[PDB]
């Protein structure tokens, strides 16, 4: 009962991430205002969830096949495109970019990217690397490539509009993000908090 | 000598990309002919900054 | 939907390039240990500005 | 639930709740439907909304 | 045509409508490096 073995506990689940908020007209005045979400996809990036709670009890992890899932809380009469991707490089930051088309193009350039209307649902996969690398669970520290396996950027391509030509201006909620994940944690521990 | 190959070969490669967004001009701004031109994007390979082509 | 391929493939390609010149420091400047270091060039792929790699 | 009373025990071999919508796609609201296998877990004790979700 | 809604009314917001992709095929001929 005192086994000193280190074994990967591959285990599945699903978790509620966040309610996304498309920006509208008032707040959306520049390009970086079109980045609705900047959410690391490290196991321990979602405090109240189950994945993060488990992560807290291990050193490491590796998404074997993760996926972000968008569920719309709006009707179809509203129309606005969204582009979502997961940069495997936690440091690559598009916030510095000024041109909107440049940002959407460097988004669509990523391999696991998707586009969709905020009235339907899709799935944003995570493309896992090839060098068997593991990542740490604790709160992000000196460097981020040790901890984060990816960073999910959610983008606003169009302007939020409704039944009529009316352009909404109140920055209202469009849907909800869900993570359908599978990862294996290696070394039992407790991470501080 | 360290000579560099004198072979001129046609390297053909294929893929998709993203040009730009379209902005319909609306009744206010649509008061002229030029106002009805929404996109003027060359198709030169080197006219798409962000892309990798 | 317009989904972009979820395929991660190892694109391997080969070729030569040009790093930099070597400058032997000579008796005047050669008065220290650091003076004997003529080249400090990383081998990262993105450390060769002019090259196409 | 009337036949239930004629026996003393039971066990669902296969159960699946099925939602039949009555609204059009012009309304929107997210829902979560889970069947908890422990009747003594009562979310009403939870104050935080995101925790409940 | 004019931009108009469900009704026969024209819109005056100068909105955005969509995006354009280029599905291309190109043949390059002479290796080099262009300056900049």
């Amino acid at each position: 009962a005192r086994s000193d073995v280190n074994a990967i506990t591959v285990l599945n689940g699903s978790d509620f991430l966040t309610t996304v908020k498309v920006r509208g007209s008032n707040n959306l005045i520049d390009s970086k205002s079109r980045i609705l979400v900047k959410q690391p996809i490290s196991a321990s990036s979602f405090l109240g969830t189950r994945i993060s709670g488990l992560s807290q009890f291990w050193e490491r992890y590796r998404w074997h096949k993760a996926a972000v899932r968008y569920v719309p809380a709006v009707p179809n009469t509203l129309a606005c495109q969204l582009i979502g991707y997961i940069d495997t490089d936690p440091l690559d930051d598009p916030n510095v970019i000024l041109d909107v088309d440049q940002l959407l193009r460097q988004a669509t350039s990523q391999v696991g990217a998707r586009q969709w209307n905020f009235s339907d649902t899709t799935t944003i996969p995570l493309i896992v690397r090839r060098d068997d690398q593991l990542y740490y669970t604790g709160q992000d520290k000196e460097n981020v490539r040790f901890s984060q396996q990816g960073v999910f950027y959610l983008l606003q391509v169009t302007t939020l509009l409704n039944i009529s030509g009316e352009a909404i201006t109140n920055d209202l909620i469009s849907g909800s993000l869900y993570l359908d994940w599978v990862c294996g944690f290696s070394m039992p521990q407790i991470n501080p908090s | 000598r360290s000579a560099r190959s004198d072979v001129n070969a046609i390297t053909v490669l294929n893929g998709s990309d993203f040009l730009t967004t379209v902005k319909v001009r609306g009744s206010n701004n649509l008061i002229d002919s030029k106002s009805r031109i929404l996109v003027k994007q060359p198709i030169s390979a080197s006219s798409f900054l962000g892309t990798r082509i | 939907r317009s989904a972009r391929s979820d395929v991660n493939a190892i694109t391997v390609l080969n070729g030569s390039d040009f790093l930099t010149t070597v400058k032997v420091r000579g008796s005047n400047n050669l008065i220290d240990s650091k003076s004997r270091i003529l080249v400090k060039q990383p081998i990262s792929a993105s450390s060769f500005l002019g090259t196409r790699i | 639930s009337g036949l239930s009373q004629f026996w003393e025990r039971y066990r669902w071999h296969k159960a699946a709740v099925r939602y039949v919508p009555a609204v059009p796609n012009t309304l929107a609201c997210q829902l979560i439907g889970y069947i908890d296998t422990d009747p003594l877990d009562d979310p009403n004790v939870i104050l935080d909304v995101d925790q409940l979700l | 045509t004019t931009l108009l809604n469900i009704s026969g009314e024209a819109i005056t917001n100068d909105l955005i409508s969509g995006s354009l992709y280029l599905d291309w095929v190109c043949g390059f001929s002479m290796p080099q490096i262009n300056p900049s």
Partner: peptide, 21 residues
Amino acid sequence: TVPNFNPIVAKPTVAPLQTNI
């Protein structure tokens, strides 16, 4: 002839009103 350089795919999905059961 590097295949699948920047491939993109399109797939439509109709969005009708009042899907009835």
